Each structure stands twice: as structure tokens, then as C-alpha cells.
């Protein structure tokens, strides 16, 4: 039952890791992005496409695990434990749901064989050595 | 800010709510059942139905769901606090996986006007007072 | 001034008390229903049938009624009087209002001549001898 | 959950409180013209008109207000609270009712248009400052 | 003078003989049911059908006999015969119009020949001994 | 209870009302001639009329009320209980039945209309004051 | 001198013995069912057909047995032989013309090949051993 | 219930007591004449006609009479009781059943219309004085 | 020498056996059966179906030995040796003089292949468990 | 009743007993040759003639009886018992199984009318006074 | 090495747990009713269809674990030991071997794709809880 | 009972006697073939041929009697019945698994009317009497 989420839409889990993880934006910006620009779509009761579905499955388990954190921040009576387990699932989960997160919202707004080229790109020119590289590194435009 | 997860497929929360809370079986039942019936499709790299998309990603959280109760079990020292957490997480975030689980297992399975018909259907039977109940309960199935 | 309610319908009030009084379900239940299923249809501005128009002034009674009944138990200091008051609205137009609600209801969902003839069977059905009578009481379904 | 009595009629309820509290005729004159032009119509079982519907509606209700109004005179056994409970309903409930009525009964007698407008001149004239109001108010006639 | 009521529509006093004493609904019952299927037609100036003739009969009979159960109750003086006579008109001569008005209103409700065959029907089956005679009796219904 | 009995043949209770009370003839003498006149058709296997139906079920009611007063005259033991019971049925009740009787065997043997006739002209005789009256009553007969 | 009542309506006494001797009702509703539904074809002067025939002949018969019990029972005076006798016509004298009424009535109500079949089956239920006999028995009738 | 044998046949009581008691001859003859002449028609399964039906029944009633008679005479102890029941019914049984068996008889072997004539015709021969009178007895002969 | 009687009409005696043993009437029943309904048959001198044969066989058969029990019985002396010979013929080979009556009578009077499917369903539904089960079992009827 | 195994095969028992009761062979011989000349057509599945059928019968129900024989004396324990018992069964239905066995056995290999016409010849010489009675008797053949 | 004995034919291993254990019938009867039903089948010299192989397969190993048992049974010394291995060999090993057996004559009796909506059915309704389901199982007959 | 494993193929029961016991390969070996050689066939969701059936049911069995040995070397006490148990179960049974494992693996590799052709020969080797027997035994190949 290994199920692989970017498997339907061309990606795989290790090509994304191939960014560093310093890269991404975090969560309440690209929240923000997301409620600002995409607000009217989310909410219409149609078939858009399948970004928008995992879109609003992402929401929804992100609001979900924000509740139960309030709760074990609230009933909890520990606090060298409420604070290690607030870290923890911050510090650990936060990373995966950015990934996931940033990924839908640049493919909605940008297009997905863009996206797709892009993280080579990013990669490719990481890893070579300054001396021998472009100056400028390579960013994401519609102007 | 306030998405309803079943709009878009013709339902609302409200709706779904005429079912009363036991009626739903549990998660490993619905996992088998997924996993019995359901499985070839859901490792295929294909967009067959908006169905199969919200279940990978519901079967998804509810892996990472039990990740972090398995490291909060194995990490924390104090009793109290590994039986709180386990207990909230099974009990009051578990009604919503079946639910979920339940209502799109059941429309692949039968067909989406089928069930939102037998809803309305059982509705009506439970509002009913107990004198005059019929003893059949409505039921799902495909043979006479 | 002898109108009745249901006569533009098809129905007539005696015929509605040929069922007994314990079948019809509670206001509750039926208030959530209508909410539930015909929320978007009620609110819009259009004519769109003769039981909508019957079903929002039904509603909008209701709702006065309860609010006439908050008052009356605030206001009020008489314990005895306020409990025997309540006790009237809740039980004596309870009854009617239920009745109401419940056609209004069944007929929009499931359609006029089924529920006209429903009544018809249930109350044969009800006033037959066991021995004699199928097992199974009707019910609307689908 | 907010059903407006008056929006699938083409009005709206914050415009019809344009006219003063005082403008209103009673209860009983209302009652007893609805009953002088249209008492066939009304008995008689045809669908002719939404607003035969509404107005049948409403006086029931009335007539269960009064109904219980007498119940609880006639069993309450403490004169004050019968007084104000009475005092209450004739005060609170009246206006409703009696704003309901007279919209149903000249939307029949005169035409919903003729009102509509009857209701914008009506604003008009009772905004303007008493210096420069002109001393006849515009009323409601065929002739 | 023998004058059979049932001849001129097809049955039989010693045909009706066979149904048990407790396969009749209360007559009350039977009172409810006819208004409540057929007012209009029970009060309308036409000669509908043979049925509602005997009908309006038996319903002004019935009425007749309540009245006299009330004056012997009020007017008497003796207890124990008021008892007697009050049970006599009560079960005796209640049987018979039980049985008038079950007829007449299945009649109406089913149609003659379903409502003959019927009896035809279960005449065999009551008259069979317990021990080969299955459980179930026969239903009329459509 | 509204049921009218002679309301199907174009009567009505109060149409009749204008006979007094004495002018019925006796039970006795109804079911006598009924008998001699249309046994023949009373037994036959066939509705030819509506009048037929009501006479039969008029003679079952009064077989039936008759076999009542036997019942109670051979059971009870209470002199007086007993008496008024017997002269209860006799008298009280059987006013009705001698008018049902007299409507239905007149109408079939003379004419609906004849009858309804016979009724109004009557009621004028009997309006007629004294002095004016002639001395011989309106009667039905053919030769 | 060895004539069979049924042998020309193609049946046999042996066939119809497959029934237990309890299974007949008595000869009073017998006479009631018979004159409820076919009397005026009795009494018209018409052949209609071979059953009207022993129906007849078989009601003069018993009538005239019951005149010579009731002379029996007023004339004789020792009221042992009075008892006796009655006994012995009500019960021994009996058997037979319950068997004839049946026949004959069934066979003008439904039909003689119903009848017919309906001894076959019946002999076959009640041969079978109680353990694996079903509960209902088979029955005549027309209505579904 | 008044059901009479004769009546399809075309005659009735009245017209076969027109001839004298004596007339008739013995069952023993009649049955030895129905064994011997008529056996093999008898016996087969075959609607042949209307006249052997009866006969058929006829001679098992008597047969069923006969042997009652002989279990009376058997196990009954008292013998004056015995002999009068015997001679009871064969002295008033026996009558009637002699007419039948004579009647059926007579018709199948010589004709249905000819035994009614010859009633009539030796009523009206009995009848007559002697003076005026054919001096020789009609008979049914070949 | 293994010939087998049922294998020439489509059965074994394997087959047969599926059956309970108390399943089978007795034998007189079967007896006054076939007296009662093939008579006329059974001895006709022709060659109606080789079920006939095979009926006359076993009734002479059964005959046969019923002539032989009763022999042995009257001019025996030993009680001991009369009683335990009449059980063992009684028992022993009744049982199968039963299945061959009973299957003879049967595919006589209802047809072959009704028979023949009928063991095999009174088999299935004798070998399963009750709760999942038709209520009561089958049985051959209507003809 | 009174069922006779030759009447459908154009025979009759007392057409049989022209034959003195001498006359037959033995039960083993029969076997024999019946094994010998038609086992493979008793023991397959056909309807091939009603002789067949009567054989297999005739066959089965020695069987049976030989059985019910070695039974007997293994079980009983009286020598004067089995010895009676044996004597008779040996000495009583071994005639009418000879007889059974010959006929069918006979009319299979020749032909029913040779066997019929055979008996009519054989009762014929057999019944003439021994003065004058030619030596050589009727014999069943096909060469000449 | 997850070779799945049920994934060919169309079924899977978790799609056959769902029914309980007392659904089953003893191992006795299954293999009575395999030979019964068909016998000549599973001896002729010919690949019938996949499951008669399966069946064949099954019906030998059946065999050597009851030739196991009896040796066990007669050569062990402690009668401990030998109860349970016996036990154990006849329960929870032999329930394994009544399902397929299960499986596979009922696939050859009623088809494949009846079976397999018959499953599904039944495991919708098992996994029901007792309150709300309906008190007689589904039945698998035609 | 008389079911013939190899007779669907072919081949007898008295045809496989011919080879002796020792010829055959251990279990682990024919196991590491089948594993090594036809690993994807047998995972496959078809029935491609008649032997992958039964080489899956008897390695399925095979696993189950495993299973078995290690529940009674597990859950049994005495030393001496674990120890005969264990031994019985290794050495009696599985020489005809060992049987079918080799005819189903080797007529999976080489074909079948080779195999069949073996047997003979082996036969017939085994047959001669040593003295001029040759020293090379028979051997299945190709290349």
C-alpha cells in the first residue's frame, strides 16, 4: 500500500527533495497566496481539475491538525510536553505540507511542464561550483 | 476559509448528518474493504475519478496521523499524557476519517445517486417513533 | 371566515386527523429537514411553487410564536403561570404545526397523489385485527 | 434561516419602513375590507394568486393568536400578568401583522407596480424638511 | 316474506354465516372510515350507486339506536336492567350492522367480484380442520 | 350526521313537516298492504328501483326492533321498567318508520311528483284558517 | 352387484382413500355451502350435468335416513336401542356421505382434473415422515 | 329445499300415486330384472345416460338400507323392537323404492313417453265403471 | 458380474445414498400406491416403459419374500431364530426394497430428470447450516 | 395382485408347464453360460431389449438371497436350523429361478416364437403313451 | 514469494475473511457432496477447467494429513501430546481447507460473477452493526 | 479415493516407480529453482498453464506444514514425541512433495514428452545388470 501522491501528475518524492529545504516559502505566506488569489474557484461546487481536489484535501488536514494542537495546548497540563510535542509536529510536518503546498500553487498559476523544468534547473544549477556559473540564480516569472 | 468537502460531489455535511454516529463501521474494516477491492487503481499513475485522488489522500493523512501517535507513544515519559493523546486522537479525529472513508468507498462501489437517494431514504425511516417503525432498515446491495 | 388551510390542495383537515396523533415526528426534526434539503430554494427570489410560499410562512410563524414564548418566560416573575403558559404553546399548536410542516414536507419530496393515498392505506391499515392484517406497517421510501 | 416574507414578491423589507409606525390603519378595518371585497375568492379552492395564499396563512395565525390571547385570560388567575401579556401581543405582533395585511390587500386592490412606486413618492415627499413639504400627501386612487 | 338483504347483489345471508365473530372491525371504526373516504358523495343529491343508498340507511339506523341506548340509560330507574338492555343493544343487534357495514364499505372499496371470490375463498379454508389447515388465513387487498 | 334521507328523491325533512303527526296511517296496516301489493317484486332477485332497497332494509329494521321488544318483554322482570321500555318502542320510535313507509310505498304507487304535490297543496289547507277551510281534506287517488 | 359411485367420473374408492378420515368436515356445513351456492340450479327442472344428478339422489337419501331415525327415536320405547341406533346411523352411516358431498360439491366449485391433482399431491405430503414433512398443507383455492 | 326426483325426468309425484298401491311389483324382481338385462352397461365407466346414474344410486342406497337392517338385527338384543323396525322399513321404504326401480326401469327398456301414456291411460281404465269399460287390462308388451 | 439396476436409467447406488434413510415411507405405502394408481397398467399384457418391467420384478420379488418369511416362521420351533430372521429381513434389505419403490413410483408418476434433480437439491439443502438456509425443505407436488 | 412375469413376452405360466420338472438345468450351469455369451451387454448403460432388464433383476435377487443364506449360517447356532432353511430355499426357488433363467436365456439365443413353438412340440411328444413314442425328442438347433 | 491462491481466479484473500467461521459447512459433507455431484469428472483423463485441479490437489493433501493424524494417534506414547496435536490438526488446520473446498464447488455449482456479487453483499452486510441491519442474512440458492 | 495426481499429464503413479527414492533433489533446492527461474510467473494474476496451478497449491501447502512443525516444536514439552513428530514430518511426507515438485519444475523446463522419454530410458538403465551397465547415468539437458 505504498501510494505515492505527485505519482498521477508526473513527479515523484525524491525529485522534489532534490530542491534544498531551505528553498521554500512558509506555510501561512503560501496560505495567504492561496486565499487571496484562489478564493472564488475553491469555494464553487464544480469539477475544476484535479489540482484544485488536493488543493482543499490539503487545507482541510492542515486546519485539522492546527485544531489538535490547540486542543493538546489546552487541556494538556505538562509543559515541557506540550511545548516538545509543539515543536515537534511543527518542526516535522511542517516541511511535507510546505512541499505539497507550494507545489499545487506554482502548478495552478504557472503551468506544470514550467514547474517541471524548473526544479532541474534549480538543481542542475546548484551543484556546480561558483566560478564556472551563472551569476544569477533562476526564478520563477510571468512578467 | 470555510471549504465543504463533499460540494463539489453533490452533498453537504448537513445532509450526511441524518445517520447516527454508530452507524459507521470502524477504520480497519474500511481499510480492508479499500484495500480488498480497490487497490490496482489506486497505484496506477492514471486520473481515473475525483474518488481515487481523496482517498489516496485521505488514506495519506490518516498514515501520518498514527506516525505521530506512534512517536508521541515511544517519546513521552509522563503516562497520562501518551493515554490523553491516544485516546483524543482514536476517539474525537477518527468520526470524520470513517465518514469520509465510508462515503467514498460506498460511491464507488454503487453509484453516487444510489446513496445520496438511500440517505434521504434512511433519514426518513429513523425520524420515524419507535411505535410504528417498520423492523427492515434500509440496506445497500445489488441482488434481488 | 370559515377557511381552511388545505382545501386548495386536495386535502381537508379531518382528513388529516384519520392518522393517530403519536405518528408525526417532532418540530425539531422536521425544521432541520426542510433546512438541510431546501435551504438554497426557500431563500431565492422566485415563485417557485404553491408549498414554498405555505412552508416560509409557516416558518416565520414558528419562529414568532418561540419568540413571544421567550419573552414571556423572561419577563414573567408568576413561576406557575409562566410554567403553565409554556406548557401551552408547546403542547396545544405543537400538534397542528407538526401536522403541517409534515405534509408540506412529504409533498414536495416524494409527491402529491403518494402522499394522498399514504393516508388512505396507513388508516386502513392501522384499524384492521392483527390476525388479519400484513405484518409490515407502509413507509415512504425513495 | 432568514427567510424575507417580501423578497419573492419584489420587495424588501427595509424598504417598506420608509412609511412611520402611525401610518398604518388597525386591525380591524383591515379585516373587515378583506372580508367586504374578497371573501368568494378567498373560500374558494383555486390557486388564483400568491397573494390569496399568504393572506389565508396570516389570518390563521391571527385567529390562533387570538385564540390563545383569550385561553390565557380566561384561565391565568393573576389580573397583571394577563394585562401584560395582552398589552404585549396587541403592541408587538399588531404591527407586523397589520403591515402584512395592508401590503396584501393593496397589492390586490390597486396593482404591485402602483405600490412600488406609491412607496418611492412616499419616501420622497416625508424626507423633505417640514419648511418646504408640500401640504397634500400622495395617496392611493383610481378615479 | 322472506326478504334476503343481500340477494339483489349477488350474495347470500348463509354465506356470510361463515367469518368468525372477531374478524369485524368496531363499528365506530367502520363510522370513521366511511366519512373519511366518502363525505361528498354520502351528501350529494344523486342516486350514485345501490351501495350508498344502503348506507345512508344503516348510518341513520345506527344513529336511531344510539339515541334509544341514551333515553333508556338517562330515563330508567333499575340499575341491573339498565346493564342488560344497555349490553343487548350494545352487542346483539351491533353484530349485524358490524357486518352490514363491513360489506358494504368492501364493496365500494374492492369491487363485487374480488370481494365475492374472496368469500368463496375463505369459506374452504375455515372450514378445514386445525391440524391440515396452514397458519397463514387469506388477505384482501388489491 | 347531515345525511338527509329523502334528499336523493327531491324531498326534505322539513318539506314534510307540514303533515301533522296523526295523519300517518297505523304500521300494521302499511306493512299489510305493501305486502298484498308488491311481495312479488320485494322477492324477486333484482334492484328495479331505489325504493325497493329502502323499503327492504326499512322492514329488516323494524323485524329486528321488533324481536328487541319480545327479548326484553320476555326477560326483564321490572314491572315498571318494563312497561315504559315496551311503550317507549312502540310509541316514541315508530313515528319515523310510519313516515318512511308512507313515503316510499305513496311515491311508488302514484308518482314523485304526485306526492311532492299532494304535499304543498296540503300545507296550503292546513294554513287555511278555520272559518274559510272547506270540509273535506285533499286526498290521493287516481279513479 | 359391484357398482363404484365414482368410477364414471374418473376416480376410484381406493384414490380417494389416500385422504385420513378426519380430513372431511360434518355433514350440517356440507349442506349450508351447498344450498348457499347452488340451489336454484337444484330445484330448476334441468339436467345440467351428472353431479346435480347424485346431489340429489344423495339429499333424498339422507333425508329419508333422518325420518327413519327421528320415527325410531319417538316410537321405540327402551332407550338403550333408541341411543344405539342414533349412534350407530350419526357415526358408522356418516363416513360416506361427508365423502360424497365433498366429491361431488368440490367437483362443481373447481373442476374434476383439479380435484384430481390435488389427491395426488396431497397423498404424497402426508406419506412423508414428520421430521422432513414442510409445515404448510396444500389447499384449494382460486385467489393468488 | 324442496327438491323433487321426478322433476327432470318430466313428471312428478302426484302423477306416479295415480296407479294403485298393489300394482308395483317386488324389489327382488326389479333388482334380479336390472342384474340380468342391463350388467354390462351398468359397470362401465361411461356417461351413458341420465337414467343409469340413478339407477346406480339407487341400488347402493338400498343396498346401504339393507345391510343397516341386518347389523340392527344382529347386535340389537331386544327382539320385539327388532321385528318392528324391520317391518317398518320394509313396509314403508319399500314403496317408494319399488316406484323408482320400476319407473327407471320401465323407461330404459321400453320408452320414456310410452310409460308416461300408459299412467294416464290405466288411470283413466281403473277409474271407469265396469259395464262401460274394455274388458282387458293394458299391459307394456315387446 | 457387477451390474448395477439404477445404471441403465442415469443413476447409482452412490447417488441414492445422498439421502437420509429415514427419508423413504414404508413399504405398504409404496405398495398401495402403485395397486392404487397403475393397475390398470401393470397387467396389461404389453410392453408399455421399462419402469413396468422393472415394478412387476420387485413386487414378485417382495412377494417372494414375504412367502419365505412366513414359511419360516410357521415350521420353525426355535422363538429365538423366528424373531432374529424376520428383523433381518424386515430391516436388512427393506431399506433398499424402499429406494427402489420409491424411486420407481416416483420417476413413474413425476418424470425423470425432476427426480433426478431433486436429489441432488434435497442433498445441498440437507448439508448446510440452518441460519443460512431456506426455512423448509423442498417437496414434489402439483401433479 | 396377480401379475405374471410371461404374460407381456406372449407367454403363460400354466403354458409353461408342459415341462416336466426334470427337464431344467441347473442354477450354475445357466450362470455360466449367461456370463459366458452376454456379459457385455448386461453391464453397459443400454435399453437393449426387455430381456435384459428382467435378467439383471432375475440376477440381483439370487444374490440377495445367497446372502441372506450365508448370513443365516453364519449366524445361527442350531445345525438343524440352517440345514432346514437351506434345504428349502435350495428345493423351493431354485425351480422358479431355473425356470426364469432358462426361458429368458433361451428365447435370447434362438427366438421367442422357436422357444414358443418348441414348448407346443415338446408337450405334444410328451404327452403320448410310452408304447409308441419315437426315441429321439424335440432339441433346440441351428445346424443341421 | 506472495503467491495469492485466489488472485487467478478473481477473488482475494481478504475478500474471503469476512465471512465467519459457523458459515461453513463440515469437511465430511464437502467432500460427499464433491464426490456425489461429480465423480466421473474428477477421474477422467482430460483439463476440465482450473478448478477441478485445485480440487484434485486439495482432496490428495486432505488425505495425507488424515493418514498423519492416525499415525500420530497410534505411535505417540504421552495421551496429552496427542490430544493436542490432534486437536489442533483437526481445527485450525482443517477450517482452511473447508474454505477452499467452499470456494471452489460453489464456483463450479452457481458461476464466478454470482459468487462474487454474493460476496460483496455479504460483506456489506456483515460489516453493518447488529442495530441498524436486518435480522435475516443474505441466501445464495439461483 | 482413486484420484491420480499425474494422470491429467499423462503419466502413472506405477510409471514414476521406475526411478528410486534417493534420486531426488532436497526441497530448498527445487524451491530456490522455482524462485530463481519463475518468479514473476507465479505472481501474475493469469493461469497461464496447468502446472503453475498445482506448483502454487503445493507450495502453499508446503508453507502450511512448515507452520505446523514449528507450532508443535514451539508449544510441545516432551523432548522424545517433539523429536519424533519433527522427524516424521521432515522425512516421511516430504518425499512426494519432493515427487511433485521435480515433475512439475522439470516439465515446466524441458517439456513434457522429454520427461516422459527420461522415465523410459531411466528405466531401462536401471534394469541392466551391473555388469554392463555403463558408468554415465542419464541426463535431462540441452546444451
Not at 87 to 106: A, C, D, E, P
Amino acid at each position: 500500500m505504498d501510494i505515492d501522491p505527485y505519482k498521477e501528475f508526473g513527479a515523484t518524492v525524491e525529485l522534489l527533495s532534490f530542491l534544498p529545504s531551505d528553498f521554500f516559502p512558509s506555510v501561512r505566506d503560501l496560505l495567504d497566496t492561496a486565499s487571496a488569489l484562489y478564493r472564488e474557484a475553491l469555494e464553487s461546487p464544480e469539477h475544476c481539475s484535479p489540482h484544485h481536489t488536493a488543493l482543499r484535501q490539503a487545507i482541510l488536514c492542515w486546519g485539522e491538525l492546527m485544531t489538535l494542537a490547540t486542543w493538546v495546548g489546552v487541556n494538556l497540563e505538562d509543559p515541557a510536553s506540550r511545548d516538545l510535542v509543539v515543536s515537534y509536529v511543527n518542526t516535522n510536518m511542517g516541511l511535507k505540507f510546505r512541499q505539497l503546498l507550494w507545489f499545487h500553487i506554482s502548478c495552478l498559476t504557472f503551468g506544470r511542464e514550467t514547474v517541471i523544468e524548473y526544479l532541474v534547473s534549480f538543481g542542475v544549477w546548484i551543484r556546480t561550483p561558483p566560478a564556472y556559473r551563472p551569476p544569477n540564480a533562476p526564478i520563477l516569472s510571468t512578467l
